[PDB]
């Protein structure tokens, strides 16, 4: 019963990257997801002789709150909410708006 | 007669150090980390079975754990048993 999952395309409801879109890269136990290309930070990576790291200003993807994103329904062209229901003895997610199953 | 299972459990590791190396080279004596409960005879048995090598004699000693400090918090390392096992003349160990 987790409404957003690893390989879902999501749209951002709030923040600096609000309105933008991207595939969820991975979801953390803390209640945050990391989405591809969305919330970007220019970390100053400190060099280390071991592990073959040169060290520089690396622009990487910081986490974002799951609440701040929403599963995008391709049909409506909009962000939607997700509900849960049992189809053929198996739980599945569905878009609240339009009532269609997520596949 | 020591049980096979027991024997396997006895021997913890080889001990690498300058002294150990010297022992290996000159006196034909291997330096092992063994179970703290492992008696000499048991250790010997383990050596014979598990390394396939005749044992002359085993000397053991208990190494006491060092007290350390990780930041502000104090904490002691574990005690462990070292065994010098002297192999018979001509016994080459892999």
């Amino acid at each position: 019963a987790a409404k957003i999952r690893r390989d879902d395309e999501v749209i951002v409801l709030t923040g600096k990257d609000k309105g933008k879109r991207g595939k969820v890269k991975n979801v953390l136990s803390s209640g945050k997801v990391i989405v591809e290309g969305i919330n970007l930070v220019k970390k100053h990576q400190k060099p280390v002789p071991a592990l073959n790291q040169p060290g520089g200003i690396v622009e990487k993807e910081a986490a974002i709150q799951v609440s701040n994103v929403a599963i995008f329904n391709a049909a409506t062209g909009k962000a939607d909410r997700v509900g849960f229901r049992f189809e053929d003895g198996k739980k599945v997610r569905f878009f609240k708006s339009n009532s269609e199953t997520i596949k | 007669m020591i049980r096979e299972e027991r024997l396997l459990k006895v021997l913890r590791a080889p001990h690498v150090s300058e002294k150990a190396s010297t022992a290996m080279e000159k006196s034909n004596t291997i330096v092992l980390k063994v179970a703290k409960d492992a008696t000499k005879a048991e250790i010997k048995a383990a050596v014979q079975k598990l390394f396939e090598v005749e044992v002359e004699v085993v000397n053991t000693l208990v190494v006491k754990g060092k007290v350390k400090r990780h930041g502000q918090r104090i904490g002691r390392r574990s005690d462990w048993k070292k065994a010098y096992v002297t192999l018979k003349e001509g016994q080459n160990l892999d």
């Binding site: - | 096979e4 299972e5 396997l8 459990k9 021997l11 913890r12 590791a13 080889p14 980390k33 598990l50």
Partner: protein, 62 residues
Amino acid sequence: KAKELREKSVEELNTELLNLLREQFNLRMQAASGQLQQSHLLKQVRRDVARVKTLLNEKAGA
């Protein structure tokens, strides 16, 4: 692996257990040196051993 190991005799089990123990020992030996670059193996082996033990107990007086 327990469902697979349940369909065995006592003698069969014992031998398997012994083998597992041996493997574990080997791993330990390797681990201490710089040979073992697959640490999870040790974890697995112990677990397997435990399972075997459990099975044995189940068989003999349970």
